[PDB]
Amino acid sequence: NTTVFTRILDRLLDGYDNRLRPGLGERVTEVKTDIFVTSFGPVSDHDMEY
Amino acid sequence: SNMSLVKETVDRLLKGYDIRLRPDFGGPPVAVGMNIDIASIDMVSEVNMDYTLTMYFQQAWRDKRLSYNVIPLNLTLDNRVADQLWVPDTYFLNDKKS
Ligand SMILES: *[C@@H]1O[C@H](CO)[C@@H](O)[C@H](O)[C@H]1NC(C)=O
C-alpha cells in the first residue's frame, strides 16, 4: 500500500500554495497552542534571563 | 474561489520576475523608508566596547512589478517568499555579530 499512500500524499500537495494561510480572505485562522515544559533551565541572575 | 484567485495573482506577480534587478533598474533611485522598534538593549560592555540591541527593523519600498488590482486586501505572504523578491542590501557598518 506504499503506492496508494504515495498517491494520497501527491494528491494532497497538488495545487497547494504554502504562501497563503488557510482561509486567507474568508475566515480567521485559529491556532490552538500547548506547551509541555520538559525542563525549566537555570535562571541566570546576572543576565536577567532564564 | 477567493483563495484560488489570490494564488493566481501571486503566481502572476512572481512569474517573469528578475531578482537581480532592483525596482527602476534604469531610472531614478528607489526610496526605502526605515522603522526601528527597539525591543531591548541587553548589555553595554566596557571590556569589549560593544553593546547588544534587539530590534524590529522594518523597511518599506515601492516595487511597481508587485502591483495587483484584482483583490482589494493587503496581502500577507509567508516569510519564505522574501527569498524571491528584491530586498535592499542594508547592512549595519559597526556591527560585530548579528
Ligand atoms: C492596507 O493598508 C493601508 C495602510 O496601512 C490601510 O489604509 C488599508 O485599510 C489596508 N487595507 C485593508 C483592506 O485593510
Side-chain angles (χ1 to χ4, degrees):
Chain A
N1 301 329
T2 51
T3 314
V4 55
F5 281 115
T6 297
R7 284 187 291 95
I8 284 184
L9 267 69
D10 282 358
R11 190 192 306 116
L12 209 67
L13 309 173
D14 173 31
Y16 198 89
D17 210 18
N18 50 348
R19 292 160 313 192
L20 318 168
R21 57 168 185 87
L24 179 45
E26 62 196 19
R27 215 177 59 252
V28 54
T29 314
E30 184 83 28
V31 171
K32 289 195 159 189
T33 310
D34 191 342
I35 290 188
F36 178 82
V37 177
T38 46
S39 296
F40 197 95
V43 180
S44 312
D45 271 297
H46 294 83
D47 303 317
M48 287 178 176
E49 85 176 6
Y50 74 96
Chain B
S1 87
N2 204 315
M3 177 81 66
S4 174
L5 180 56
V6 174
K7 177 195 172 192
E8 270 195 10
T9 290
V10 171
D11 281 358
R12 170 172 63 78
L13 290 189
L14 301 186
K15 175 173 310 183
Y17 190 94
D18 216 340
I19 179 175
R20 286 92 50 99
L21 324 174
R22 64 161 178 88
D24 317 318
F25 188 44
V30 57
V32 172
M34 307 288 187
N35 279 322
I36 298 187
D37 182 327
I38 308 185
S40 87
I41 296 181
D42 296 332
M43 59 204 49
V44 188
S45 200
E46 285 93 17
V47 309
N48 314 316
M49 300 288 184
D50 63 38
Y51 75 102
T52 289
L53 75 164
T54 289
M55 81 195 76
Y56 296 74
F57 185 55
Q58 307 166 17
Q59 312 156 86
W61 59 99
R62 198 192 191 283
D63 212 329
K64 286 179 176 57
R65 302 167 301 190
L66 314 164
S67 87
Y68 57 93
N69 48 15
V70 191
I71 50 181
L73 55 90
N74 301 349
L75 274 179
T76 307
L77 306 169
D78 193 19
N79 54 78
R80 276 178 298 169
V81 76
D83 303 298
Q84 313 165 35
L85 306 191
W86 175 91
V87 296
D89 199 329
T90 291
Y91 82 99
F92 310 92
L93 182 85
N94 67 344
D95 74 329
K96 311 165 71 169
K97 181 178 178 182
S98 82

